[PDB]
């Protein structure tokens, strides 16, 4: 092990004693991967064991199974779960794989050499050695590109991902014409993050998703080769801190942003996160309620078209500021919502009361009714309900869990970026420990006021 | 010397009365923009239809209101989270009626506070100081972001965002508890502990140092030199190190505010606080009410009242 007397780092900063220990650092990272793979496998098998075919996955508080279901495994027409053995296979595979990674980490943390540069030059690396650092980034960049292409392969081959917008009903579909038009693929990137544009969260077609992964997959592999055969340019070296903590701070900041984006994706996107498995989105639940009553009242004998509300802005239907006909009520804020159950009734100009008056299919109703009841609203003790509700329902939208968890994760990792980045910059300057007590810069600065 | 270099120096100049920086280059204009509109709005802004129900709530000192009641009405519900730039509005009058100023102020304010955090580190690096003062300033910034951005987004409208006013702040707090029971959220509990504790620690530390330096000497060197340590009630050695004490003086409050901010963000995703309504039941099944149930009774009252004409359906899923 190590002691503070020889490192200057206390036990609460012990892992910081592994910065220059390449061999030990390898074991630490490899081991941590084992933990991640372990949970993926363990929790998956736990979910499979606690899964029941009489209830939707979202009602069973399952988060991992929805991911496999979206990949198009053990799912059928309407999102109905045919079998769960595929899910069991995934858990078993990850769990056993975690053992291999665990052994490697333990070895590279005990028997393995504390450093590798002395023995294995290829693995041997020193922070600041930009060339080597860029090469390492390249290798991992290629790996991520291959992973994205594996998804693209599963979409156009080896079966297909589940398409909630599939024609004549939602089910797994083999993407055959993935969007490769740069304008469409990169359009999302330049889209405003505000309402309507929804930036990249707006992606509603699997064709763009698979096509976008095609673009990112290629660029990452090409970028890896570039970083493998190129060294940072003068401008970069003069505008970046070359240190392990600095490199970590860059990753911390990036992963923190990715966390926030993932939170929004799980809360707004319904394509990449099928509402059939992940449950309805906040906007989806609201629109579903308006549709549920609109249908019920219309059947009772109410003209939803000319039904003035208390404010006079239409009880069931109204016009979006843009002009599109939208459901009335506070759901006006979610007028930009788009779901496979509501699209058929829509048309060039907002909703089509013709479809609403006649052509409303029973499933369009049943689905909306189910979504309305299973809204994302919930409590920490898992007491399902808008609020001020009695303890009767035990359900919290999986979307809520992912959105809340990843948001908090992103926030902390951003704070970690600020901590590591600032310390890295201060370390480079040399004032990380504190003031010289003899070269205090302020004492040499202008007396200001 | 290259003029751009000359400019770069002036920007990083520490001789400036108020250190300007690359962060300040964006912070100064953004905050100046938000301050100007806020002052004009809090004084002459016409009524705004925040609920998007064609019912405009009056604001600004000119249109009645007062220092306490006056506030900047949040954007209309109709706009929701849609971007509403002045140029998008057909007429400045429409921009005011729809509640555009609020969105503009918040956008030019959040950027400024984030740049303010970066400016803090910039000067610390220029002066040669440690770089974690901004991390402490991250706690307040995180809270502001949640009430003016994260929550508005999670709910799906800028109208949900806390109004820029005293009475508006109170309204935001009340409706929030009526829909999220923030009081029963463990994270808000941590935040209250942070502020209540921070005040306690501030009063004690201030009293100890004051009584000591009562006379450059160390904050407590005097009392330490006498050796009459108050271990009688301060029987401990954890904070014997001044650095250890000051660290805690910063960690306790900042970490608490971080949790309350995250708590608000989680509740923005409909993750309400503990719900123990009708949790205690007798042998035959009769519900034995508790203090929680009484709190629920109040929450119901605030809920049935909030937006008296802005609900056409029973469930408030929005």
């Amino acid at each position: 092990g190590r002691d503070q007397e020889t490192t200057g780092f206390a036990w609460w900063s012990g892992n910081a004693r592994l910065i220059n220990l390449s061999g030990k650092l390898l074991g630490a990272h490899v081991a941590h991967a084992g933990l991640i793979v372990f949970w993926a496998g363990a929790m998956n098998l736990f979910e499979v064991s606690h899964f029941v075919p009489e209830k939707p996955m979202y009602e069973q508080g399952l988060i991992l199974l929805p991911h496999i279901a979206t990949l198009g495994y053990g799912v059928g027409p309407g999102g109905e779960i045919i079998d769960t053995f595929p899910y069991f296979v995934s858990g078993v595979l990850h769990l056993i794989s975690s053992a291999v990674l665990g052994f490697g980490g333990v070895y590279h943390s005990l028997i393995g050499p504390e450093t590798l540069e002395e023995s294995y030059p290829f693995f041997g690396y020193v922070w600041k050695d930009k060339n080597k650092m860029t090469n390492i980034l390249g290798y991992h960049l290629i790996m991520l590109g291959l992973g994205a292409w594996l998804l693209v392969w599963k979409a156009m081959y080896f079966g297909g991902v589940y398409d909630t917008w599939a024609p004549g009903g939602g089910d797994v579909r083999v993407i055959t014409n993935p969007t490769t038009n740069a304008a469409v693929i990169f359009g999302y990137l330049v889209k405003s993050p505000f309402g309507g544009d929804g930036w990249i969260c707006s992606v509603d077609n699997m064709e763009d998703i698979i096509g976008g992964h095609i673009w990112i997959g290629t660029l990452e592999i090409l970028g890896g080769i570039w970083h493998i055969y190129t060294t940072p340019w003068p401008w970069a070296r003069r505008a970046f801190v070359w240190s392990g903590e600095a490199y970590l701070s860059y990753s911390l900041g990036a992963i923190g942003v990715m966390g926030f984006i993932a939170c929004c994706m799980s809360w707004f996107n319904n394509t990449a996160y099928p509402s059939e498995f992940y449950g309805p989105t906040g906007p989806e639940a609201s629109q579903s309620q308006a549709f549920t009553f609109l249908v019920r009242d219309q059947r009772l004998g109410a003209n939803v078209a000319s039904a003035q509300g208390p404010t006079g802005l239409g009880k069931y239907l109204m016009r979006s500021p843009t002009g599109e006909i939208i459901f009335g009520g506070e759901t006006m804020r979610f007028w930009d919502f788009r779901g496979p159950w509501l699209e058929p009734l829509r048309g060039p100009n907002g909703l089509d009361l013709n479809k609403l008056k006649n052509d409303i299919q029973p499933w369009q109703e049943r689905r909306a009714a189910e979504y309305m009841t299973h809204a994302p609203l919930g409590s920490l003790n898992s007491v399902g309900g808008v609020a001020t509700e009695i303890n009767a329902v035990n359900f919290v939208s999986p979307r809520s869990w992912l959105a809340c968890s990843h948001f908090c994760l992103g926030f902390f990792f951003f704070i970690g970026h600020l901590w590591h980045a600032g310390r890295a910059r201060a370390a480079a300057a040399g004032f990380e420990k504190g003031i010289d007590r003899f070269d205090e810069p302020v004492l040499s600065m202008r007396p200001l006021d | 010397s290259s003029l751009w270099a000359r400019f770069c120096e002036w920007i990083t100049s520490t001789e400036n009365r108020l250190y300007i920086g690359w962060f300040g280059v964006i912070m100064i204009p953004c905050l100046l923009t938000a301050t100007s509109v806020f002052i004009i709005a809090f004084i002459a802004a016409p009524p705004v239809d925040i609920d998007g129900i064609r019912e405009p709530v009056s604001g600004s000192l000119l249109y009645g209101n007062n220092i306490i009641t006056g506030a900047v009405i949040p954007t209309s519900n109709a706009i929701g989270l849609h971007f509403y730039p002045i140029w998008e509005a057909a007429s400045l009058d429409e921009w005011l009626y729809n509640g555009g100023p609020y969105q503009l102020i918040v956008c030019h304010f959040l950027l400024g506070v984030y740049c303010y955090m970066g400016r803090e580190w910039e000067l610390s690096f220029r002066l040669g100081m440690r770089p974690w003062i901004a991390v402490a300033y991250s706690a307040p910034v995180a809270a502001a972001s949640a009430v003016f951005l994260v929550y508005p987004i999670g709910q799906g409208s800028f109208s949900d965002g806390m109004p820029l006013g005293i009475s508006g702040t109170f309204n935001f707090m009340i409706v929030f508890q009526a829909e999220h029971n923030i009081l029963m959220h463990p994270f808000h509990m941590l935040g209250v502990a942070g502020v209540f504790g921070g005040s306690l620690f501030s009063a004690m530390h201030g009293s100890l140092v004051t009584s000591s330096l009562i006379r450059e000497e160390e904050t407590y060197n005097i009392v330490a030199a006498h050796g009459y340590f108050g271990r009688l009630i301060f029987q401990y050695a954890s904070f014997n190190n001044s650095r250890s004490l000051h660290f805690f003086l910063a960690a306790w409050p900042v970490i608490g505010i971080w949790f309350t901010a995250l708590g608000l963000s989680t509740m923005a995703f409909n993750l309400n606080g503990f719900n123990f309504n009708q949790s205690v039941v007798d042998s035959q099944g009769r519900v034995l009410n508790t203090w929680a149930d009484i709190i629920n009774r109040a929450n119901l009252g605030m809920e049935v009242m909030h937006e008296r004409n802005a609900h056409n359906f029973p469930l408030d899923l929005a």
């Binding site: 200001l448 006021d449 | 000119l62 220092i67 450059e216």
Partner: peptide, 30 residues
């Protein structure tokens, strides 16, 4: 004119803050 009174108070407070930052006693003390 209550609004005029309120505006005066707000303006006055801001003015005090201004001089407190630019017309403050030189900080000869550390």
């Amino acid at each position: 004119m209550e609004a005029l009174v309120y505006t005066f108070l707000l303006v006055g407070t801001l003015g005090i803050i201004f001089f407190s930052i630019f017309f403050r006693d030189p900080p000869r003390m550390i």
